[model samples]
Target: MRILEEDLKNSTYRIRIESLDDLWYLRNILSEGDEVSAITFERERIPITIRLKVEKIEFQDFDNRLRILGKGKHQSITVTVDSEISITKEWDDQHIDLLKEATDEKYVTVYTAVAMDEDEAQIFLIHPYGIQQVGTVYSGRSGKYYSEASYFDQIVNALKNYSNSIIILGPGFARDRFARYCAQRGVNVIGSFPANRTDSGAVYEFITSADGAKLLSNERIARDKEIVDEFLVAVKKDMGVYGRDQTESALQMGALSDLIITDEMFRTEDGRRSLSIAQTVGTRIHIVSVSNDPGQIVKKFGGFAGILRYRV
Candidate 1:
């Protein structure tokens, strides 16, 4: 993310989205009521000045774009990746925190391990923006010979340049043993979990699970889990409501303390309306990723919910 300009008196800041992680920060900093203006393609790839009241935000991971959809003064507007935009908000500490995070040079990187057995393992490197396979290593008997040291050495060589935390995972004790090997070499192994295979699918499964959230605590996936867990507790205690109708009613009554929404509904009309209402009432909103458990729970409950200021 890059900040182009700032006007404190007007409560507005101009910024450029630079990466997938920047979209995450933008999602955190922006609210439903904020106004955004950018040059966007309206038709035939023609660019125009489009201003929007930010009713919804969708971070498109596959396409590497941040989709913003909302109503302008007279029409609906959309803004996307590489679009320079100005945002006007009430200016709060959360906004400042997001800006600081955006400018920070230290981003999180995750090392994934998929130990197939005592002699073979696959490794992957994952960052907020991308994932890559770092090759595989094998050991043990080959027709009459066994070399444990060779396997460990190969794995170590594959991971030598990575200084970020590591997550070792597999179905058995192989992962645990490898973790110990890494520790003995002064490598940083943060956590490990169980997986069924040593493939990309297994790596993705581990990343979206609760264990992944714990291992990558600073990442958005983990933060979404924490927020949803808190919301669930609030619901169980009668301080929150799930489902669209109930949340909308609470928003209408100005009783919402916080609003939780999923990416699946961000493009729907009801979802946009709910967001607009929440912003009108000054309610805080959190957007959860659909791949995580919390997001799945929200989808099961109709994709929207709220913790209320009072029982409605």
Candidate 2:
């Protein structure tokens, strides 16, 4: 995230959202009864800088925009990656600390993934929301125009055109072979792994698997696997509460040590309020991306879930 301006005297920070993680932090930071300003459409679709008392905060996984809603005037401002937004609120030590931690001055990490076999290659980005398919390359084996060198170059060009930490994985010799090909062509392969298949399904499988989780342990996707797995275990043991009503009730009792929620749930009214309660009660905040498999399970369980601290 970029800090465009920080005027502490009036307690306002103007920033540009840089990633989905930034949206997550902004969602937790800008709560009910805060002020946010941005240029948005008016009655005639005229762009105007509107300041809103944040009565509502909305984050849709697909929209890539965090929306702030104002009561009375009903004005709304949408905040997205690369968009500038100004937030005015009382400066707390915690909030400033978080803001300071946010811009620790690293560019957004781009994780590109490739899963391939002998015949075809799939490329994707390990995006914060989910795996994003960028493009595809085919081996063209037995086709009218078959060239092995050309296919490798295409994969290299597709992946390395923009600098990213690439991960190659698949069954057979495809991944190791491609890894060497890319290294020779100046494309760095950060890591490689084996899977049953080569595609987004394989990518998702790795993301939720023990091997993948261990390799990417420091990463958020690995963290997703851990929490989701733990939650599932908790469910079988009857020590977990899912859905809004039960979750809210458990949180009210301060019986949950950690609250896991889907990004979809966090966008709702109950979710917004429930998050505040979790924060107040010191429950660890963990939200999963709705587009991924881990999040799909949470969605099936009613938007949110939490492990009981004392088996309530």
Candidate 3:
């Protein structure tokens, strides 16, 4: 996000959210009693500014917007990606620190999404503004011989220009099959996902879905996924422990090196104690979103996991 304007006398800052992640940060940074001013909800489209003492905040990951509402008012100010809002609050040190940290954090990860089926494929680049349609290619028409390879190769060739991570999706086997073909051609693919549509709508839907929010929830999802993968592999090798029982055992034995949990788990009493103990013992801590895949993976294994300092 960019702090477009600042007024020291009133302690107000007009901030422009640059991406999906920025919305997450803004959600965290906002709190009750904070004064936020923006264009109020009006059906007639008359420009009316309303100042709200942030009584409640609703962050909608699917819509990529933050709804800030004041008590006793049905009117709300929705802050969406790339939208600007004025925050006038007493600049406490904590608030200042959080704002500074949010601005300081930077990520260079974007995804190239391919929505394909047996008939055709639509390729797009994800942006904060929305998905950018790169091209649309039909399937199997090599001199009317109906060659699947020809269409797949056309897509592979077209996708080569973008350096972003690739996420392939569609309703059926073609996208999954395409993933294999792309990999066979030395193109590294993240994986394949299921989507209902085969156009730009599919690309949009995929990114906003629970799994697609994986990329939005954490800019470091690549590293987080790797860590989760490593933990799973470690379990296969006997160097991993998950859930309360095994975690306690590993911790008691001084064998735990890293403790990973979802943001949901981190809210519980047990989770707090576990994190406190892990911190005291100098174990690495990774907190991920429960709505995201890695978080869901950790949740499935018991809300948390620990990799061994040395195998138990």
Candidate 4:
């Protein structure tokens, strides 16, 4: 990682160290205008320029190694020899942009739908910062209990693949049982709460409850306060927080960071709007369907995308 010796090309130097001690020997040892050779890790290289004023030079000595530290205005930059300086800092901008994009994608948010049965069954899970879908079992109710486990397992597996957190919710004892199951398997739970029995309505119920507020209060949720605040305002206004129409409007306005439109939502106007907005803003959009579980990671991370207003 050190800057290769050949990279310097005999340039004049005025190095200033800060907060470090022990290189007193180099102090006054070289004249202010003298050129010198220095080497350090590329990542550690400071933005030192030539012709900059050399301020104080503090040093440090520990474990038989001497280091220079301090502050200075890099004076100038020039190569003594006729050689090209191939500094790798050129990628810094790209790296920073890429990092921002990644963070934005992670914040896109997801809605979880965990279904125990189709008829009179409970569906519970966290709603990401913005709009999210409820975890539902298949439409036809008869085989729900047995099918619920397989559905949960499928969703959990999909969630584990994503590098986010999880928020688990459900009505009845099913969600509780599922939470315990996840714990036994060493699955991380960001927030676990209860919801009434219903299809998507259950998901909505949890988001509007005091317990949901507690889940939102997690520090991780605060990272994207803007989105979370918007959702809260919607909740306060009695507008659907995870509703197709309202969420679609937000997405269309480019207010969405990442979109977690369910597969069902995707098939409708909400999904279309989400995709369009995501494309326009270059945001990441993940489509969750009855066949997959993206909410596990969302909950594991302490609920989905928005700031938590309460603690779990």
Estimate every model's Cα lDDT from 0 to 1: 0.66, 0.70, 0.68, 0.40
In terms of lDDT, the best-performing candidate is: 2
Report the Cα RMSD per candidate.
Answer: 8.0, 6.0, 9.7, 19.5
Task: Put down candidate 2 lDDT per residue, 272-291, tens digits, no spaces.
Answer: 68778888888887876566
For model 2, the stretches where C-alpha displacement exceeds 4 angstroms are 17-34, 38-83, 89-102, 105-107, 142-147, 204-219, 253-255, 276-283
Best by TM-score: 2
**For each candidate, how many residue pairs have backbone atoms clashing (under 3 Å)?**
0, 0, 0, 45
Q: Write one digit per residue (lDDT tens) for candidate 4, span 1-312.
A: 112233334432233322121122122222223334333344333333222223232223211111222244332332222211222122222223322332343433343445343233333333232233433334343644355566556556655534435556555666566677788788766545665554554544555567654544332222233233454564566542354554455555555555554433443554455566667765555543232233333333223232112111
Candidate 3 achieves a global lDDT of 0.68
User: In candidate 4, which residue ranges exceed 4 Å CA deviation?
Assistant: 1-129, 132-141, 144-155, 158-160, 217-312
Better of 1 and 4 by TM-score: 1
- Model 3: CA > 4 A from native: 4-14, 24-75, 85-108, 113-144, 147-219, 248-254, 267-273, 310-312
> Ten-residue segment with the worst summed lDDT in candidate 2?
55-64
Error of 4 at 53 (Å): 49
Better of 2 and 3 by lDDT: 2
Question: How big is the RMSD of model 3?
Answer: 9.7
